[PDB]
């Protein structure tokens with residue numbers, strides 16, 4: 163149904179990964195322990211009790227993985243840099259040459275094949291030491307650490323990397339980390355949970371996000387002042403971008419839907435484009451959102467060059483401002499509740515990932531939302547994809563037969579081509595993921611890969627979707 167020629171000639175087509183999810187070699191090459199290294203070695207977090215110690219062993223097997231990408235005919239590869247490999251002890255601890263060597267080699271390998279790097283600086287991970295020293299995202303000192311990390315990466319890799327992302331989905335990592343307490347540093351308060359470390363779900367998430375925003379701003383000021391004229395790259399931020407529809411087509415649910423949307427990606431994007439938090443958020447939260455100082459605002463004038471759209475699913479949103487809803491959900495402060503069902507019918511075909519339904523026109527609608535809110539600022543679809551999991555899969559053959567993933571990709575790509583024809587400045591698409599990998603709290607129980615991985619042997623095998631994507635990219 164959909165073909166390569168239905169997109170612009172210079173469109174990026176790739177796959178996406180992150181460092182913790184694929185690399186393994188978690189203590190090799192002088193790398194320090196990350197937050198997720200520490201987290202996954204505690205009980206009661208990961209569904210299958212697994213960790214990222216080995217994962218896909220991409221640290222040793224990167225060249226095979228680059229060859230697999232190449233055989234699909236991708237022209238780009240989205241990956242993240244492990245902060246703990248570059249600056250194991252943060253900014254006063256010295257640059258780790260072994261980390262620099264690993265990423266240089268990876269970048270050179272993909273460029274040899276004509277595959278453009280599309281690099282995420284941080285994707286959920288930090289050196290544990292930054293948490294231990296000053297509480298990471300709860301202290302403004304993180305801005306300087308992140309600034310320095312960014313500066314090192316730009317200086318070492320930026321001659322060959324033309325697309326950078328500061329953060330992957332800080333909307334998810336912050337709320338999970340500081341509101342629900344389900345991600346490290348596992349902080350929360352009632353009614354979201356009882357976290358033994360402590361926390362304040364009504365305050366700390368907004369402090370953390372504040373420092374993420376300003377870490378971005380510090381990094382992009384560094385890039386534009388120091389590196390941009392020589393390196394000629396673009397610096398963006400990636401946000402988790404779910405589309406929301408009103409549960410009932412009435413004003414209170416429409417308004418609730420607008421709130422749900424505004425509390426997600428504009429939480430970060432409004433400050434980065436307009437220099438203030440979303441007014442939808444400010445109206446409800448007031449002083450819980452910290453202020454931007456004159457110094458902050460100076461950095462915020464560098465803004466961002468693109469929006470990284472991680473879009474998977476679409477949900478219904480309903481009002482909680484004038485109805486009493488269950489408390490302790492991540493949408494609590496937005497005074498909306500979200501669901502995938504209306505009247506015993508799901509919004510689209512359910513999948514093995516909770517909240518992920520097959521709703522292709524969500525990607526069109528999400529892109530148009532960005533277009534209108536941010537005056538068609540350039541966008542990249544930095545993640546889109548489909549999970550297999552559960553009882554139905556006992557052997558390799560079951561995982562390889564992924565006509566369901568093919569149908570997802572075809573539907574979403576069809577709607578993406580449509581929104582671009584309709585004027586959206588979308589410039590690429592990255593399928594999550596090239597390989598099955600460690601799916602955070604789900605461990606290895608969810609498989610998003612175009613390639614199946616046997617974790618006993620590390621054997622890579624193409625699923626039908628790998629063959630499909632190859633055929634699509636051949637036109």
Ligand SMILES: O=C1O[C@H](CO)[C@@H](O)[C@H](O)[C@H]1O
Nearest residue numbers: 180330331402472545594601
């Ligand atoms: O949005 C995402 O979706 C992926 C699937 O849940 C996950 O693996 C990535 O790390 C995350 O960036």
